[PDB]
Amino acid sequence: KRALILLINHGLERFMIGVPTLTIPKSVRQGTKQWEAAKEIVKNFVQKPRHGIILPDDWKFDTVDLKSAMPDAIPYLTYHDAGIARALGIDFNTVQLNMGVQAVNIGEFVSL
Amino acid sequence: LEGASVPVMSTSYDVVVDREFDELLQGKDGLLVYHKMLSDGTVKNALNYIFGRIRSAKWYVEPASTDPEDIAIAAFIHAQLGIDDAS
């Protein structure tokens, strides 16, 4: 459950804002004014997405196309939460975990 | 008759040896798997429910007849077991 929460926290940062990529020619190296300008463009795409992007005719700003939708991890979270509450030996009605599964009809001579 | 001339034979065959055919579950290595299955939520839940429902079965000693000797030895072994919780 903890590892899956960290996977969702790493996945939403990709599927909700999109990782930016930017291609420059080889003339620009690190520590230059153009390098700082490219840093400023990427930082403004992350932080202030309303100043827009203004590029020279050689630079190709793009988002990295993951080419797949984000898979629904909610059933896996409910599965491991069901595993915890099942290992504790308690029904899913007292602890609030009854989510779309049917209520108990009559039950047995006693409950769980 | 004289007696039982027929011995209690094994349940063994060429592959199945003593009610088991898997070599992983053959000897005491199967006890390791049976102990590691206690780390499951489903298995421990079912075992806790079944054993707790066994422990609240309302047991009672039933004697042999209505003779006071049978009632005496029944109450004797009832005190030996302690069906009432503590002793």
Side-chain angles (χ1 to χ4, degrees):
Chain A
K1 182 177 183 293
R2 293 180 66 188
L4 186 60
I5 288 299
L6 269 73
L7 285 175
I8 294 169
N9 288 319
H10 286 170
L12 288 173
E13 293 181 354
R14 291 171 177 85
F15 284 102
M16 289 179 69
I17 55 96
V19 288
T21 188
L22 180 59
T23 61
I24 59 172
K26 292 181 181 180
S27 66
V28 177
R29 293 179 181 176
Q30 296 179 357
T32 64
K33 292 181 181 180
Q34 299 296 108
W35 187 259
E36 183 68 28
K39 285 185 176 179
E40 183 66 30
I41 291 298
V42 174
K43 186 178 179 181
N44 287 321
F45 178 75
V46 172
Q47 294 178 356
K48 294 180 182 179
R50 291 181 180 178
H51 290 172
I53 306 301
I54 295 95
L55 294 177
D57 53 354
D58 56 353
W59 292 353
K60 300 292 179 67
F61 182 75
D62 194 0
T63 60
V64 176
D65 295 332
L66 279 78
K67 296 182 183 179
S68 177
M70 183 180 73
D72 196 0
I74 297 298
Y76 296 96
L77 285 173
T78 59
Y79 177 69
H80 289 291
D81 199 0
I84 292 171
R86 187 179 296 111
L88 289 173
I90 194 167
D91 53 350
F92 289 170
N93 289 319
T94 59
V95 58
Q96 296 299 108
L97 195 58
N98 190 357
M99 289 182 182
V101 303
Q102 293 185 359
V104 176
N105 195 3
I106 301 168
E108 294 294 326
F109 182 75
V110 298
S111 178
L112 177 66
Chain B
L1 294 175
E2 192 272 332
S5 296
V6 179
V8 177
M9 298 178 186
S10 297
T11 64
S12 65
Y13 195 64
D14 61 355
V15 180
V16 176
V17 174
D18 291 331
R19 299 288 300 275
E20 292 293 327
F21 62 96
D22 193 2
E23 292 86 3
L24 183 60
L25 279 75
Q26 187 68 42
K28 291 177 72 178
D29 294 332
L31 277 74
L32 286 173
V33 181
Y34 290 154
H35 181 77
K36 287 180 183 179
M37 287 176 70
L38 298 175
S39 177
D40 296 324
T42 303
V43 175
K44 189 178 179 181
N45 193 7
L47 287 176
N48 284 320
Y49 179 74
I50 284 173
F51 292 151
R53 189 167 167 85
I54 288 170
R55 290 180 181 175
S56 297
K58 297 183 291 295
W59 296 97
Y60 66 96
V61 172
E62 184 179 2
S65 297
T66 324
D67 293 330
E69 183 179 2
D70 291 333
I71 301 168
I73 63 172
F76 181 77
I77 62 100
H78 184 274
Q80 299 297 319
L81 290 175
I83 304 301
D84 50 349
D85 293 331
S87 179

